[PDB]
Amino acid sequence: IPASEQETLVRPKPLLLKLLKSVGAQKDTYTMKEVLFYLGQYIMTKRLYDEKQQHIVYCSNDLLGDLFGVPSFSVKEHRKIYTMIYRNLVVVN
Amino acid sequence: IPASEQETLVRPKPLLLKLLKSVGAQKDTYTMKEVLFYLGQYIMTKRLYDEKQQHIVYCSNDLLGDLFGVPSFSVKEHRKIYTMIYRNLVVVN
Ligand SMILES: C[C@@H](c1ccc(Cl)cc1)n1cnc(-c2ccccc2)c1-c1c(C(=O)Nc2cccnc2N2CCC(N3CCCOC3=O)CC2)[nH]c2cc(Cl)ccc12
Ligand SMILES: C[C@@H](c1ccc(Cl)cc1)n1cnc(-c2ccccc2)c1-c1c(C(=O)Nc2cccnc2N2CCC(N3CCCOC3=O)CC2)[nH]c2cc(Cl)ccc12
């Protein structure tokens, strides 16, 4: 399917869903951009980014660290982030 | 996104949508498989397939012929069919 005519939906696993809904999300399926929107909000509101180095997220004491399995990560490393998110998506076949 | 965790939706243009709804479809977005399900039904119910050569669809006197722009096509030629369907999908970006 041509990328222009195509809408792609993902279904977060229970823990990611609870996180997304904790910042105002209502539904069960999302585009990746929508998941990123809410994850961005979560990070901002819990002030997980380092004020001095605003590209590193420190999440070791937060549920995000559980979901992602790392104590911290760089927002500049997109593919790593997508990988971490994919681990929290329901296989729908 | 891993293909297993991914649901892809398309939005039929007005004429295809009217065709899909003419055979029981209710919604505005569909997976490709869902569009194919309803197109298959349309073809069966209007008996557009050739009883003697059941792989050729004759649609020149039908709205399907307008949508697809051909007087007939083979069901064995999948990529041609997908191409014809893509012309009837709303670009959603
Ligand atoms: C391109 C984007 C990103 C997308 C995809 C990927 Cl893979 C990576 C980055 N981005 C860039 N900086 C952050 C990001 C970075 C740090 C903390 C939070 C979000 C993000 C981000 C968003 C997001 O929706 N961003 C966004 C989208 C559109 C416009 N503007 C955006 N940003 C708002 C906060 C803004 N910001 C950052 C801290 C300093 O002040 C400030 O205004 C910096 C600009 N969502 C995320 C989810 C996670 Cl897990 C991690 C990072 C993000
Ligand atoms: C794999 C499939 C197809 C998919 C994708 C693509 Cl690209 C091409 C073929 N298929 C194969 N034969 C026809 C197809 C062929 C001719 C007429 C109508 C549908 C179709 C079909 C379906 C569909 O959903 N098929 C289907 C799906 C699942 C199980 N069984 C299925 N079929 C029911 C009618 C069945 N059949 C055909 C006539 C003789 O009696 C009979 O029982 C032959 C078996 N939808 C369509 C839409 C269009 Cl525009 C054109 C053809 C089809």
CA distance A35 to chain B (A): 13
Pairing of strands B56-58, A6-10: unpaired
* Widest pairwise Cα distance in chain A: 44
- Residue with structure tokens 């500049």? A76
A81 lines ligand 1 (CB under 6 A): yes
Total structural domains in chain A? 1
Residue with tokens 């039929």: B12
Encoded amino acid at A47, one letter: R
Chain A residue with Cα closest to B86: A1
Cα B1 to Cα A69, B4, B10, B40, B41, distances in angstroms? 19, 8, 17, 29, 31
DSSP secondary structure string for all residues of B24-76: T---S-B-HHHHHHHHHHHHHHTT-B-SSSTTEEE-TTSHHHHHH-SSEEETT
Resolution (A): 2.1
- In one letter, which amino acid is A26? Q
Q: What is the CATH number of the domain that holds B70?
A: 1.10.245.10
Cβ(B91)–Cβ(A4) below 8 Å: yes
State which amino acid sits at residue A67.
Answer: L
CA–CA separation, B82 and B93 (whole Å):
19
Check if A6 contacts B (Cβ < 8 Å).
yes
* Calpha distance A66→A45 (Å, rounded): 18
Range of the domain at A59: 1-93
Report d(CA A12, CA A87) in Å as an integer. Answer: 9
Q: Are A30 and A12 in contact (CB under 8 A)?
A: yes
Whether the Cβ atoms of residue B60 and residue B40 lie closer than 8 Å to each other: no
- Counting ligands in written order, the one closest to the CA of A59 is 1
